[PDB]
Design a protein around this ligand. Structure first.
Ligand SMILES: Nc1ncnc2c1ncn2[C@@H]1O[C@H](COP(=O)(O)OP(=O)(O)OP(=O)(O)O)[C@@H](O)[C@H]1O
Ligand SMILES: Nc1ncnc2c1ncn2[C@@H]1O[C@H](COP(=O)(O)OP(=O)(O)OP(=O)(O)O)[C@@H](O)[C@H]1O
Ligand SMILES: Nc1ncnc2c1ncn2[C@@H]1O[C@H](COP(=O)(O)OP(=O)(O)O)[C@@H](O)[C@H]1O
Lengths: 242, 15, 233, 271, 234, 262, 254, 243
């Protein structure tokens, strides 16, 4: 029975900290950094077979070279990405050059703070705050393949890699154990599958999940339904071997 | 030889 | 037991208190520390950083306003950010209207005039943090204190938040000493650093858990974070 | 106290003549009967089967009909009490008596019990500052603490009942003790199906069957009144002397009795 | 409209139950054809159904809709949808896709969520139709949270649980609907389980390319329903 | 307990509301005969309420200082097993002993909550409780005769006990036990800790300002549950954060799980 | 003398027969054993020890398993104080129990109480309060400086005057609550240690499906899977069997 | 009870108790006075130190609104500063008009209705402050005090904080001793006496003083803080009055 802009005797707000467990209802969504590329992964939460999962799009493409993956509540985040696309392109105009990631992502977490005294001179839109959080991945030529994390409380961190959502508290422990510096790309195109195969409520298919790499050479790329399947056999090339 | 009785009762008061 | 005078802001207590505010100021008590002090010539910022896991990068604690100012915060970033982006306009406006560049102390006397415009209107919370402001002008160097109340004061050196009394005590033990320092910031800096070891609940500072950034009667604002602070540990 | 308890007189309520359902009913036989058939199976994988169950209400929709049918089947004891009959003027009389069952449950390994409509015992934990009525609240604590102080469960079996749960019953029930919080309510077809699956036994329908339309149009009701539906046709037979069994006058009873309890029918708004 | 501590919303853990009261309808994605089918009140006496607002509605030459739930909150969307239709044909000179307006109205059901004093809808809808200058069928389903999906069949209404699973004993991906007579047999062999009456209590409609819309009589229904009213016998 | 007491301790808490009270009381004990020569119906007592955590009995121990006199021994005493107001029976023989030794200090406890606000809660027959309060009046009656007795009580603040006290011949005067400063609340914590091994190498003065609305009742409780934790750790030296924020925070707030801080 | 029998024949409990979050045990284990066995640890600081572990935890939580655990561990004598034998219609005769109890108790050694469900009698024409007054007379006397404690539990902490509950009565109180998944995981290991299963599977992800809930449903819900296995005739258990019913226990409740 | 929860809800007594709670907030603050001398006004205030770390003489609590005014306050530090920032522009928008400085009755007539406006509505906080001001116009000397209910009256002296009971009876003990006329310099001595005389309610702690006056005679009726030996002349004196 609390409101928005009111503290507690303990100081810990109610609603935003309640907004920090709605994500734990949603799907899973992971991306992991390699110094030659970064991955992205999903759990479709496909509820019925007749469905055509080409339409469900938990993965996007900001530009030819940046992509993100929304988790928790997939509906609302469909709005904010159009913000990012606006600031990306807008910055592609005034300077004739792709943007650094940290110049962007401050904006997005400067949006969700708008429910009361946003940036300098901000009228309070957003009666309630975004009940969704997501991951940002891509290159800029100053720091490296600096993944970024966003949550609607209005802050961002930089990561090597971690997870969200349902399998958060358990799955990341394996990731915390099994990341390092000198690994490959495709080892990360498959290590996720060792993980996501844990916390799916059914045997994996080529359609439960889907993947997308990211490269300073080509740029952005989503895979196909089959080209996940071939590596799963490659995982079973180790699951059957070991 | 007895005085050890005690019976409960019923009331209904304004809240 | 259940103070109904705990809802919106404007409601006074039956004793002269705003229970929102007093219950806000314990926030920074749940936030970290960032200390600072000054000589007659040079002033300092300091901040422990608070890290998420063994993988993440770190939460930041210092920001530059402009070439002759910086600051450091405690508790919340986001409501504290906008005040930084706020007063940049009120430090550019100076250097374009006038070019007679910005004196520090009026900024605080601007800044106190902000939050009070957020307490006594329905809707809106306080910008609920404490923070520390530094810089230099024609008047020498100055340090400041902040409260989301509005109270701001000219101090020699102070501390914030959790575990801070240990470091807070070194200063009264030492205010005879560090005021007479000049042109030699190195040993000055490690005053606080040794002094904030008083706070360490066995986390044992590292190359990267610390951020320092200072100012002088000569120096523009510089940040020493990353890997340059092997100098001090 | 003992006098009411040993009700060994099962009626002719015929378990498996009832046409209601299966899954619920295996669930109890699995809860009760099969454990009394080859409980080594529970010993195979090492199982402590449950300590009784609790159905829900939805009155006039099959609370009890199985139960005396189980009593017809019980192949064991069967017990029966009332909390209102259990309670007295003086303090702790009934609570002193409530203990005395479990030893009389200690009577038997085949030790089972129905209980009669708790709605005046253990209903809800109001503070009861208003005198007197704390006796009830003083009694439930005498039971639940007696129930699980230190018990090997001694086939100390139980099956409970009520008409509405959320009206009462906040904290008394707990899993393991009563793991199966279970249901009975209208089937939405199977009242059409197996009810007259039973009642086709006696009657003749001396001209036709007609049953292909003596049927349910998803009509909100409770099939318990079907035992009226069979009735008044015979009466309306004898409102006009039909010694035989018709299908035509049978129409009225749904048109007559189901028509009384009208609903709002405000669905000129969700089209 | 705020966040509970269980990650939910009060008002929207509620609203989508409203659509679970009213009428029931469905469409499918045939081999080379697409169809809808919906519900009507038989026994509604002293009335002429020619002019009542059909649960079907059309938005362009080549696309249609079928709502459920409320009726008032349905009428509003068609209007401002129709705008976007016969405006999108102007600025860009090309007609619509299907996903565009779906992407649009997917957004409006949260523009009417996150603001002060605004209820969401007691509405859920779906659409259907062929893109211009293409052939592949397209249908999309909606609900007030905005999440727009692409179900090969989608029903919202009464008794719909088994109906939501009835198809799965009937439909086959690699055995899609051959033709209209079977694909409409599919369209009706689902809905009839909740009909519990004759043909008068429903209304259907169909699409084919280049805006080949049709609506079928009560009598055409009484042609085919008999064939399974004859084949509901053996 | 009955004794001609020892010296009053350090005045400390509330003292600005207190010096004006021994004024009020010793004169009834000192040359009230001269008042009786001046011819006045000077009182037989007054009332000092306020929340506990105060040192109320110390002021009772301060009572016999300017004139030696003996204490009292009774605490919720009239709540008996029998029909009688056995205490109220004793109150006669006890107030008779307050009639004995005219230098005498009389302080009962919890007059409120031994005497309800308006005793509507209980039945008609209370076990002679109005009769007991009738004894109190009829004993105050005998006490009103002389200057031997000098009476006072203490409980929840006001409007919690009977309203009889309005008559100036009965009680005539009220003071409260307000919330004090804390430098003495600092010292008493050493007194609480005086029976326990520890050190004081802390700046607990800013601390003492930080807390409030944690009464001496509370602060008579705090001192131990952070002595255990540093023992549970294993430490022995007293310390600030493990006791100050270790106790003052754990009162109602705990489980610091906040992320968006930094 | 209705409850005139100290303890049962065999308490079957262990401090590791419990998940119980590992933290609520220490101070409880500290108060009960460290003054008991190591008062030199008390005089190591020179302390004012406590006398009672005040407590509240919603039922269907292993406090009572935790309560029966100290029984089987310490091997000392034991009691049960409940309104049945305690509260009796004969006014005053009810207090023969407390007197013969405590006046005996001071004589004996390691005869510490588990007088649970005092919420029955200790709640505010009713004579219950005078029994509650009969209690506190007994406690202020011996309360400090003894091996004995006063540790019990309840269901309604806000249902009693704290006039009794002053700091010298139950100081280092107790609070219970449901576990994390990890607490829900380690408890799940316990009742998993009986049957035949599909050994070597991902149990932990089910403890992800432990929202606000009791352990009691988990020791339950495994047996329903075996019951589900019984009807399935599954001589050995699998994963989905646990799922096929645990999905129903909460939804039937929700 | 149930009427004491928000602005603009009168009582059966005929009041809003909320501002009467404000009086206890301003009661929880520092001492401060200002005296009507024979030719101008005086200002002096209490300024308590917590730690040595607080710098002396960089943290004034007096505020100026324009040349011919000084104003102080007590209680809420920010809130008593806001209306100054309203003050500093109002009269500036009055010297704008007829090109003459502003009277003091012009001040309160342009303030004393302002704070009232923060007690009409259910959406704002009454300014929990008591406040002083003074200075000179063509007419001569003036002085006033404010209370948070808008009220204000022309005094010869005032006092606030928890320095109420000392000074009020003291000024009662002053005025009869010296009604003939008290020039500027002399009250600067006798003023700083009172603050040393009034700290005894809070002599647990320490402070340092801050003074300002304005004379038609000395400073052309302009505002001018104290900074010099004259201050040190008075503290050397004021200790004797408490000696
Ligand atoms: N499946 C069924 N077949 C036959 N009769 C039924 C069926 N379900 C309900 N009934 C009818 O419902 C009536 C009572 O049902 P139910 O057990 O719900 O209530 P009850 O036990 O009589 O009520 P109470 O328990 O309050 O005494 C019986 O007369 C019975 O004929
Ligand atoms: N944290 C836990 N640790 C161990 N067992 C648990 C836990 N939570 C629940 N259980 C199990 O659930 C079952 C029922 O719980 P339990 O009997 O302790 O309820 P209770 O706390 O005794 O209720 P009451 O307070 O009414 O006596 C027990 O068999 C117990 O082992
Ligand atoms: N100088 C002192 N010496 C001893 N105790 C003191 C002193 N000052 C305050 N106290 C405290 O005063 C409290 C007594 O408050 P009081 O109202 O008498 O309690 P009660 O209402 O239970 O009689 C004690 O908790 C005690 O610690």
């Amino acid at each position: 029975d609390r409101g928005v802009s009111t503290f507690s005797p303990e100081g810990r707000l109610f609603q935003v900290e309640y907004s920090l467990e709605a994500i734990k209802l949603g799907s899973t969504a992971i991306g992991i950094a390699t110094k030659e590329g970064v991955v992205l992964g999903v759990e479709k939460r496909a509820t019925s077979p007749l469905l055509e999962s080409d339409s469900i799009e938990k993965i996007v493409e900001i530009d030819r070279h940046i992509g993100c993956a929304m988790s928790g509540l997939t509906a609302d985040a469909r709005s904010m990405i159009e913000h990012a696309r606006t600031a990306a392109v807008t910055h592609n105009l005034y300077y004739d050059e792709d943007i650094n990631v940290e110049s962007l992502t401050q904006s997005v977490c400067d949006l969700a703070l708008r429910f009361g005294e946003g940036a300098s001179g901000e009228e309070r839109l957003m009666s309630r705050p975004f009940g969704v959080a997501l991951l940002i991945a891509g290159h800029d030529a100053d720091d490296g393949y600096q993944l970024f994390h966003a949550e609607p409380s209005g802050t961002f961190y930089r990561y090597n890699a971690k997870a969200i959502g349902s399998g958060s508290e358990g799955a990341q422990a394996e990731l915390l154990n099994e990341w390092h510096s000198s690994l490959t790309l495709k080892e990360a195109e498959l290590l996720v599958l060792k993980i996501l195969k844990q916390v799916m409520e059914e045997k994996l298919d080529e359609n439960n999940a889907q993947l997308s790499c990211i490269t300073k050479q080509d740029g952005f790329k989503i895979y196909d339904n089959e080209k996940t399947a071939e590596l799963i056999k490659e995982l079973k090339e180790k699951e059957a071997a070991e | 030889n007895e005085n050890v009785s005690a019976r409960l009762g019923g009331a209904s008061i304004a809240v | 037991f259940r103070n109904n005078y705990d809802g919106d802001t404007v409601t006074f207590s039956p004793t002269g208190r705003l229970f929102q505010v007093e219950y806000a100021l314990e926030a920074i008590k749940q936030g970290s520390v960032t200390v600072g002090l000054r000589s007659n010539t040079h002033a300092v910022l300091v901040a422990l950083k608070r890290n998420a896991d063994e993988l993440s990068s770190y939460q930041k604690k210092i920001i530059k306003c402009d070439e002759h100012m910086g600051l450091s915060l405690a508790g919340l970033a986001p409501d504290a950010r906008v005040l930084s982006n706020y007063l940049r306009q009120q430090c550019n406006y100076s250097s374009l209207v006038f070019n007679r560049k910005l004196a520090v102390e009026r900024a605080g006397h601007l800044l106190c005039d902000k939050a009070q415009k957020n307490t006594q209107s329905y809707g809106g919370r306080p910008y609920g943090v404490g923070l520390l402001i530094i810089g230099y002008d024609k008047s020498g160097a100055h340090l400041l204190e902040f409260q989301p109340s509005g109270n701001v004061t000219e101090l020699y050196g102070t501390a914030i938040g959790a575990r801070s009394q240990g470091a807070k005590t070194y200063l009264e033990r030492t205010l005879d000493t560090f005021i007479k320092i000049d042109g030699n910031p190195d040993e000055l800096i490690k005053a606080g650093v040794e002094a904030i070891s008083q706070s360490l609940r066995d986390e044992s500072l590292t190359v990267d858990n610390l951020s320092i950034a200072i100012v002088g009667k000569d120096t523009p604002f510089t940040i020493y974070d990353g890997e340059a602070v092997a100098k001090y540990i | 106290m003992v006098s009411v308890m040993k009700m060994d007189k099962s009626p002719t309520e015929s378990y498996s003549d009832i046409g209601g359902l299966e899954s619920q009913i295996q669930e109890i036989k699995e809860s009760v009967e099969l454990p009394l058939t080859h409980p080594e199976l529970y010993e195979e994988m090492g199982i402590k089967p449950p300590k009784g169950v609790i159905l829900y209400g939805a009155p006039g929709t099959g609370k009890t009909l199985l139960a005396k049918a189980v009593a017809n089947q019980t192949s064991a004891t069967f017990l029966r009490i009332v909390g209102s009959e259990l309670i007295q003027k003086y303090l702790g009389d009934g609570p002193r008596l409530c203990r005395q069952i479990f030893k009389v449950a200690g009577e038997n390994a085949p030790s089972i019990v129905f209980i009669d409509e708790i709605d005046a015992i253990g209903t809800k934990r109001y503070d009861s500052n208003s005198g007197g009525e704390r006796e009830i609240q003083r009694t439930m604590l005498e039971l639940l603490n007696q129930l699980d102080g230190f018990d090997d469960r001694g086939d100390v079996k139980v099956i409970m009942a009520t008409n509405k749960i959320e009206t009462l019953d906040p904290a008394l029930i707990r899993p393991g003790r009563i793991d199966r919080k279970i249901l009975f309510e209208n089937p939405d077809l199977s009242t059409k199906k197996k009810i007259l699956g039973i009642h086709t036994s006696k009657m003749n329908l001396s001209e036709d069957v007609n049953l292909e339309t003596l049927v349910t149009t998803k009509d909100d009701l409770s099939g318990a009144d079907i035992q009226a539906m069979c009735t008044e046709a015979g009466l309306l037979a004898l409102r006009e002397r039909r010694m035989q069994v018709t299908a035509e006058d049978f129409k009225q009873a749904k048109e007559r009795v189901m028509k009384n309890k009208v609903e709002e029918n405000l669905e000129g708004l969700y089209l | 409209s705020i966040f509970s501590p269980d990650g939910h919303i009060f008002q929207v853990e509620y609203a989508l139950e409203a659509v679970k009261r009213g009428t029931c309808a469905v469409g499918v994605k045939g081999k080379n054809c697409v169809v809808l089918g919906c519900e009507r009140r038989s026994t509604l006496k002293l009335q002429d159904t020619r002019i009542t607002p059909s649960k079907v509605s059309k938005i362009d030459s080549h696309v249609v809709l079928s709502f459920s739930g409320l009726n008032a909150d349905s009428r509003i969307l068609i209007e401002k949808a129709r705008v976007e239709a016969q405006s999108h044909r102007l600025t860009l000179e090309d007609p619509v896709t299907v996903e565009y307006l779906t992407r649009y109205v997917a957004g409006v059901q949260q523009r009417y969520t996150q603001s002060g004093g605004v209820r969401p809808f007691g509405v859920s809808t779906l659409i259907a139709g062929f893109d211009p200058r293409d052939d592949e069928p397209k249908l999309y389903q909606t609900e007030p949270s905005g999440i727009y999906s692409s179900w090969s069949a989608q029903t919202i209404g009464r008794n719909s649980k088994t109906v939501r699973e009835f198809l799965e004993k009937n439909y086959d991906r690699k055995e899609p609907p051959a033709t209209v007579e079977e694909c409409v047999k599919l369209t009706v062999r689902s809905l009839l389980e909740v009909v519990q009456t004759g043909a008068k209590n429903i209304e259907i409609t169909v699409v084919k390319p280049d805006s080949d819309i049709v609506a079928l009589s009560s009598e055409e229904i009484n042609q085919y329903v008999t064939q399974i009213e004859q084949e509901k016998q053996e | 307990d009955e004794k001609p007491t020892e010296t009053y301790s350090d005045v400390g808490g509330l003292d600005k509301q207190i010096e004006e009270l021994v004024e009020a009381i010793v004169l009834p004990m000192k040359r009230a005969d001269k008042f009786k020569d001046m011819g006045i119906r000077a009182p037989k007592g007054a009332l000092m309420y306020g929340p506990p955590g105060t040192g109320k009995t110390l002021l009772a121990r301060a009572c016999a200082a300017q004139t030696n006199a003996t204490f009292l021994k009774l605490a919720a005493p009239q709540l008996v097993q029998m029909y009688i107001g056995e205490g109220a029976k004793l109150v006669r023989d006890a107030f008779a002993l307050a009639k004995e030794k005219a230098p005498t200090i009389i302080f009962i406890d919890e007059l409120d909550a031994i005497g309800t606000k308006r005793f509507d809660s209980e039945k008609s027959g209370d076990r002679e409780v109005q009769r007991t309060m009738l004894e109190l009046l009829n004993q105050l009656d005998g006490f009103s005769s002389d200057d031997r007795v000098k009476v006072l009580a203490a409980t929840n603040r006001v409007d919690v006990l009977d309203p009889a006290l309005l008559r100036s011949g009965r009680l005539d005067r009220k003071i409260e036990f307000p919330l004090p400063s804390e430098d003495s609340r600092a010292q008493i914590l050493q007194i609480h800790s005086r029976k326990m091994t520890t050190d004081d190498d802390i700046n607990w003065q800013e601390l003492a300002r930080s807390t409030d609305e944690f009464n001496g009742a509370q602060l008579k409780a705090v001192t131990v549950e952070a002595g255990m934790i540093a023992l549970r750790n294993g430490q022995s030296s007293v310390k600030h954060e493990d006791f100050v924020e270790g106790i003052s925070e754990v009162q109602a707030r705990k489980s610091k799980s906040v992320s968006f801080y930094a | 003398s209705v409850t005139m029998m100290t303890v049962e024949e065999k308490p079957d409990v262990t401090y590791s027969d419990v998940g119980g979050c590992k933290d609520q045990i220490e101070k409880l284990r500290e108060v009960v054993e460290l003054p008991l066995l190591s008062p030199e640890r008390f005089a190591t600081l020179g302390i004012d020890p406590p006398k009672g572990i005040l407590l509240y935890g919603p039922p269907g939580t292993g406090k009572t398993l935790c309560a029966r655990a100290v029984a089987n561990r310490t091997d000392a004598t034991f009691i049960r104080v409940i309104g049945s034998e305690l509260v009796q219609k004969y006014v005053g005769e009810g207090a023969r129990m407390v007197r013969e109890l405590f006046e005996m108790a001071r004589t004996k050694k390691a005869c510490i109480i588990f007088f649970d469900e005092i919420d029955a009698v200790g709640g505010a024409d009713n004579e219950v309060q005078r029994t509650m007054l009969e209690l506190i007379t007994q406690l202020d006397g011996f309360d400090p400086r003894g091996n004995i404690k006063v540790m019990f539990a309840t269901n309604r902490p806000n249902t009693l005057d704290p006039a009794l509950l002053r700091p010298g009565r139950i100081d280092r109180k107790v609070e219970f609550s449901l576990p994390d998944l990890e607490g829900r995981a380690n408890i799940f290991r316990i009742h998993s240690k009986s049957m035949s299963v599909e050994r070597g599977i991902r149990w932990e992800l089910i403890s992800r499906l432990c929202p606000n809930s009791t352990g009691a449903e988990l020791r339950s819900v495994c047996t329903e899977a075996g019951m589900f296995a019984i009807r399935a005739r599954r001589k050995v258990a699998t994963e989905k069997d646990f799922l096929k019913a645990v999905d129903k226990v909460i939804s039937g409740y929700k | 009870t149930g009427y004491d929860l928000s602005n603009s809800v009168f009582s059966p007594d005929g009041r809003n108790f909320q501002v009467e709670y404000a009086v206890k907030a301003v009661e929880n603050g520092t001492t401060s006075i200002g005296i009507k001398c024979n030719d101008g006004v005086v200002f002096a205030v209490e300024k308590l130190i917590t730690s040595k770390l607080l710098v002396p003489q960089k943290n004034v609590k007096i505020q100026v609104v324009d040349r011919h005014i000084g104003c102080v306050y007590s209680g809420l530090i920010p809130d008593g500063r806001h209306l100054v920032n309203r003050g500093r522009e109002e009269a500036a928008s009055f010297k704008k008009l007829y090109k003459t400085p502003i009277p003091i009755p012009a001040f309160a007539d342009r303030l004393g209705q302002y704070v009232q406006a923060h007690t009409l509505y259910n959406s704002v906080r009454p300014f929990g402050v008591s406040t002083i001001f003074g200075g000179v116009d063509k007419n001569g000397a003036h002085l006033y005090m404010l209370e948070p209910s808008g009220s204000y009256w022309g005094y010869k002296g005032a006092a606030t904080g928890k320095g109420r009971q000392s000074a009020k009876a003291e000024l009662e003990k002053l005025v009869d001793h010296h009604p003939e006329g008290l020039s500027a310099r002399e009250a600067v001595k006798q003023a700083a006496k009172i603050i040393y005389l009034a700290h005894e309610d809070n002599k647990e702690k320490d402070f340092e003083l801050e003074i300002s006056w304005c004379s038609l005679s000395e400073t052309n009726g302009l505002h001018k803080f104290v900074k010099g030996d004259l201050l040190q002349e008075a503290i050397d004196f004021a200790q004797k009055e408490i000696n």
